[PDB]
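Kindly inspect both lines:
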Amino acid sequence: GPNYTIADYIRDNHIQETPVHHGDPGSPTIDLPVPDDWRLLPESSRAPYGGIVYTQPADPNDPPTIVAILSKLTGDIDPAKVLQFAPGELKNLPGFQGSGDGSAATLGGFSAWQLGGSYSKNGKLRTVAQKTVVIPSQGAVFVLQLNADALDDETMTLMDAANVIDEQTTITP
C-alpha cells in the first residue's frame, strides 16, 4: 500500500518487534471488557492477544470480532511516531473509505489513536476500526492494537462493542 505504516516505521528504524502473550514476564496486564452477547476469544492466529466475538452472528463463519494484538518494541523508539503512522494500515486496505485519518485518544493514561471506515473483501463490504495505544515501559515500548471488523450489516453491533472496548479496557504496566 502507498501509506506509511507502523510496520514501515519499525523496518526503517531497525526496531526489534516481538509478540507478547498473556502472562509474559515484564509485560503489561491488559483486560478487555466483555459486553453482553459477546464472548471471550482465546489467543489464536486470528486473535494474537485474544479478543471478543459476537455470539449471534448473521454468518457463523464470519462473526463480528474485536481482537487485540500486543507487541514489544525495543531499540530507538519514538512513541509519538507509532501513533503518527497508525492510520496507514487501515488506509491501505483494499477499497478503504474513511472520514479522515482519525483522532487522538487515550487509554489508561497512555496516548492512543483511533480511526475507522469501510473496506471491501471478497466482494463484501466490511466495517473496520482500530485503536492503537503506545505503552512505554522498562526499556521497551509496548504497542496495543484493538482491531474491530465485521460485515457492513452488523456495523451497529460492532461499534457499540468497540466503543466499550476502546474506553473500558484496562492497562496495568
The first strand starts at residue 16 and ends at 19. The helical segments are 6-12, 79-84, 88-91, 155-168.
